[PDB]
Amino acid sequence: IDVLLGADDGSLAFVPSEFSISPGEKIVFKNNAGFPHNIVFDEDSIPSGVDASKISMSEEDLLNAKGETFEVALSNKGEYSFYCSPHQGAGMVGKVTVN
Ligand SMILES: [Cu+2]
Protein backbone atom coordinates (compact mmCIF):
# COMPACT_ATOMS: atom_id res chain seq x y z
CA ILE A 1 0.00 0.00 0.00
CA ASP A 2 1.16 3.46 -0.97
CA VAL A 3 0.83 6.23 1.53
CA LEU A 4 1.38 9.86 0.59
CA LEU A 5 3.28 12.06 3.03
CA GLY A 6 1.41 15.31 2.67
CA ALA A 7 -1.73 15.68 0.59
CA ASP A 8 -1.98 16.99 -3.01
CA ASP A 9 -3.50 20.15 -1.62
CA GLY A 10 -0.51 20.67 0.66
CA SER A 11 -2.30 19.45 3.86
CA LEU A 12 0.05 17.97 6.42
CA ALA A 13 -1.46 14.51 6.47
CA PHE A 14 -0.81 10.85 5.66
CA VAL A 15 -3.03 9.74 2.80
CA PRO A 16 -4.68 7.41 3.71
CA SER A 17 -4.06 7.86 7.51
CA GLU A 18 -5.97 4.88 8.71
CA PHE A 19 -5.70 1.53 7.02
CA SER A 20 -5.44 -2.26 7.58
CA ILE A 21 -2.83 -4.57 6.09
CA SER A 22 -1.85 -8.23 6.38
CA PRO A 23 1.44 -9.48 7.88
CA GLY A 24 4.38 -8.80 5.58
CA GLU A 25 2.43 -6.43 3.31
CA LYS A 26 4.65 -3.54 2.22
CA ILE A 27 3.82 0.04 3.19
CA VAL A 28 5.54 2.60 1.04
CA PHE A 29 5.46 6.08 2.58
CA LYS A 30 6.23 8.58 -0.20
CA ASN A 31 7.15 12.24 0.19
CA ASN A 32 4.51 14.22 -1.64
CA ALA A 33 4.04 17.74 -0.29
CA GLY A 34 5.28 19.91 2.61
CA PHE A 35 8.36 17.70 3.10
CA PRO A 36 10.64 17.02 4.89
CA HIS A 37 8.73 14.35 6.67
CA ASN A 38 9.36 11.15 8.53
CA ILE A 39 7.33 8.26 9.91
CA VAL A 40 7.76 7.32 13.54
CA PHE A 41 5.86 4.53 15.23
CA ASP A 42 4.72 5.36 18.73
CA GLU A 43 6.60 2.83 20.87
CA ASP A 44 3.79 2.78 23.44
CA SER A 45 1.12 2.22 20.73
CA ILE A 46 2.23 -0.78 18.80
CA PRO A 47 2.14 -4.42 19.76
CA SER A 48 3.96 -4.57 23.08
CA GLY A 49 6.88 -6.89 22.18
CA VAL A 50 7.53 -5.20 18.85
CA ASP A 51 10.79 -3.26 18.48
CA ALA A 52 9.83 0.15 17.18
CA SER A 53 13.34 0.62 15.76
CA LYS A 54 12.90 -2.22 13.36
CA ILE A 55 9.96 -0.50 11.68
CA SER A 56 10.42 3.17 11.99
CA MET A 57 12.52 6.24 11.33
CA SER A 58 13.97 8.07 14.28
CA GLU A 59 12.57 11.48 15.17
CA GLU A 60 15.66 13.16 13.68
CA ASP A 61 15.74 11.07 10.44
CA LEU A 62 14.03 12.84 7.58
CA LEU A 63 12.89 12.21 4.02
CA ASN A 64 13.99 15.32 2.16
CA ALA A 65 13.03 14.99 -1.52
CA LYS A 66 9.71 14.80 -3.32
CA GLY A 67 9.15 11.12 -4.17
CA GLU A 68 11.67 9.86 -1.60
CA THR A 69 10.20 6.89 0.31
CA PHE A 70 10.35 4.90 3.51
CA GLU A 71 9.29 1.29 3.09
CA VAL A 72 8.33 -1.09 5.86
CA ALA A 73 6.47 -4.35 6.23
CA LEU A 74 4.85 -5.02 9.61
CA SER A 75 4.69 -8.59 10.83
CA ASN A 76 3.00 -8.72 14.24
CA LYS A 77 -0.79 -8.41 14.34
CA GLY A 78 -2.54 -5.52 16.15
CA GLU A 79 -2.76 -1.71 16.05
CA TYR A 80 0.18 0.51 15.19
CA SER A 81 0.02 4.28 15.73
CA PHE A 82 2.50 6.47 13.97
CA TYR A 83 3.16 10.10 13.29
CA CYS A 84 5.40 12.51 11.45
CA SER A 85 7.65 14.09 14.10
CA PRO A 86 7.88 17.74 12.83
CA HIS A 87 4.15 17.83 12.00
CA GLN A 88 2.55 15.81 14.77
CA GLY A 89 0.83 18.79 16.36
CA ALA A 90 -0.57 19.87 12.98
CA GLY A 91 -2.36 16.50 12.85
CA MET A 92 0.07 14.43 10.77
CA VAL A 93 -0.62 11.10 12.39
CA GLY A 94 -2.12 7.77 11.47
CA LYS A 95 -2.84 4.24 12.57
CA VAL A 96 -2.36 1.00 10.68
CA THR A 97 -3.91 -2.26 11.78
CA VAL A 98 -2.24 -5.56 10.95
CA ASN A 99 -4.90 -8.22 10.90
CU1 LIG B 1 5.50 15.66 8.09
CA distance 92 to 18: 11
**Which residues are within 5 Å of ligand 1 (an ion), measured at CB?**
37, 84, 87, 92
Residues marked as binding for Cu cation? 37, 84, 87, 92
CA distance 82 to 38: 10
- Within 8 A by CB and 6+ apart from 8, the residues are 32, 33
Would you say 27 and 72 are in contact if contact means Cβ atoms under 8 Å apart?
Answer: yes
> What is the whole-number distance in angstroms between the Cα of residue 3 and the centre of ligand 1?
12
Residues tagged active-site: 37, 84, 87, 92
CATH of the domain at 18: 2.60.40.420
Quote the distance between the C-alpha of residue 54 and its chain's center: 13
- The residue range of the domain holding 61 is 1-99
Element (H, E) at 78: strand 78-83
| Total tally of structural domains belonging to the chain | 1
For residue 36, give the 3-state DSSP assignment: coil
For residue 14, give the 3-state DSSP assignment: strand
CA distance 22 to 74: 8
User: Obtained via which technique?
Assistant: X-ray
